[PDB]
């Protein structure tokens with residue numbers, strides 16, 4: 001009861017004109033609208049945000065995981081829901097989470113149109129909580145990005161990440177335990193290590209939506225669980241191989257610290273962590289200069305990261 | 321020593337292995353509108369052609385307290401049906417046709433057997449609802465979920481024509497109320513069920529009720545009313561639909577009724593199913609509390625004009641529903657919204 005009164009303003013402030021047990025009409029511009037949907041959790045980053053007592057941006061990570069997966073197919077995020085499960089409801093912690101959710105929905109252009117708070121005393125111990133996200137997007141049927149147009153000679157453009165995002169934090173913590181350092185006191189390029197690790201996931205919705213209107217995009221890969229190895233081949237057609245130019249960008253320093261402190265090997269770094277790349281965009285080579293100029297001039301760190309070449313190799317991704 | 325994800329406790333390919341097993345039961349729920357398959361970054365589904373001004377109806381749910389009792393008695397096949405039922409039954413309240421469903425599964429270490437049986441119930445509920453299971457998420461949080469505990473959440477999206485949204489405005493003095501029988505407590509009132517089971521010292525497995533174990537009455541999967549309600553809206557003027565969930569008769573009936581209207585419930589029009597008499601006896605529960613906590617055999621109530629009752633009862637009973645006239649609507653002169661007599 002004390003929660004719904006505090007979150008009524010954050011639901012109303014995200015309301016789109018299409019919003020009217022949650023009612024939402026389709027945007028008027030779509031002729032053959034196709035609905036794009038997905039659900040997600042934050043992951044182990046919750047328990048790291050709990051240990052540091054900072055839940056401010058954890059709701060941004062939840063929305064970002066959703067909406068970045070929708071926009072891969074060219075979908076425009078429409079509305080969002082959450083399922084907040086906890087043992088004993090901390091009104092202050094839940095309000096901070098939902099506020100971060102509202103902030104992520106505003107960056108995505110979608111409305112927080114409802115949700116539920118459930119209390120399970122025997123299941124969750126302490127003040128722990130698990131939040132499930134749900135987003136629905138709309139894409140024009142003729143403009144769905146399926147990756148079939150990915151051909152030999154396409155160039156890969158990377159979008160820089162704000163940090164580890166919401167994947168790999170089970171290894172992050174395990175590295176913190178063996179190293180035995182305080183993330184709040186361990187300074188790292190002028191900031192504490194905790195700030196590098198708790199940085200919310202970058203939301204790529206608006207910049208990728210602008211890119212699709214202006215250049216011909218063949219495929220987009222959101223680097224989440226599994227990193228480069230698992231997520232890049234999901235958008236590759238048969239008999240294609242992505243060759244990442246490792247020298248084309250420097251790792252953000254947080255990933256250097258994680259490798260040294262955990263003695264993490266090369267292949268494992270690119271599986272568990274994004275290593276500074278939030279998304280990879282496959283597009284024809286003549287479109288690259290237009291895309292790089294658009295993305296970099298509109299709040300993104302974009303650079304040429306690799307190429308797609310014809311290859312029947314079973315190793316679909318090469319990082320050399 | 322080179323640390324890795326293997327040294328921790330999350331296995332990304334555990335959910336990938338679960339998706340590897342459940343691809344069969346998921347594919348069987350696929351609708352013609354569904355495009356693509358599992359594994360992609362997002363689930364694709366077109367709008368049904370019938371809607372010229374389609375409005376999307378969405379909801380999230382969790383079976384909650386009933387999930388606790390399902391683990392205790394070590395039965396997790398029907399709890400997926402309960403998850404879908406609470407979603408899809410709420411969609412049709414406003415006239416929405418269910419389109420697709422997603423689920424969020426969280427636990428400590430993933431038991432692929434336990435999860436696949438839960439998903440199989442979710443897929444079965446989607447078959448009954450006419451919607452598709454088009455995606456989900458499987459998260460492993462070893463420190464947060466102790467023992468074999470797991471938490472599942474459901475999300476659903478339905479479609480309704482803009483000009484046909486049911487908002488209770490068409491409810492008028494004289495509308496006859498038709499009840500749809502429930503299959504049991506459905507998914508609400510299970511904190512009181514657990515309490516009654518404790519104060520009475522009752523093991524619901526070694527306790528027989530009408531020849532069946534009491535655990536079969538308590539954990540009966542929620543009845544899904546989607547196909548019956550959609551046909552009702554298509555063939556009969558439906559003014560309001562009450563979904564008796566948390567809060568029983570007192571809370572859920574006025575939620576769909578317009579202001580200055582009152583629902584009069586004929587208590588003699590039905591007898592409580594035996595599971596509710598047991599819960600009332602074993603807990604010494606006031607009947608007013610039973611009408612607040614449990615649905616008491618009535619899962620849904622439909623408001624419609626009086627001349628259309630016989631046709632509606634004919635349709636509902638034809639789909640295997642337990643339908644009967646439960647009451648009427650009358651103008652509330654600033655009175656009580658629900659009256660059971």
Ligand SMILES: Nc1ncnc2c1ncn2[C@@H]1O[C@H](COP(=O)(O)O)[C@@H](O)[C@H]1O
Nearest residue numbers: 004007082083084098113114115116117
């Ligand atoms: N965690 C949450 N996030 C957003 N909205 C919520 C949440 N929990 C409840 N609500 C909203 O609060 C109202 C009452 O929800 P309930 O308590 O489930 O009846 C509805 O409008 C819900 O959508």
Ligand SMILES: Nc1ncnc2c1ncn2[C@@H]1O[C@H](COP(=O)(O)O)[C@@H](O)[C@H]1O
Nearest residue numbers: 335339358359360423425455456457458
């Ligand atoms: N519990 C689940 N039930 C149904 N589908 C799922 C579940 N978990 C994951 N999926 C689907 O499996 C695919 C793999 O998702 P990801 O784990 O993000 O690679 C996606 O299409 C998901 O929607």
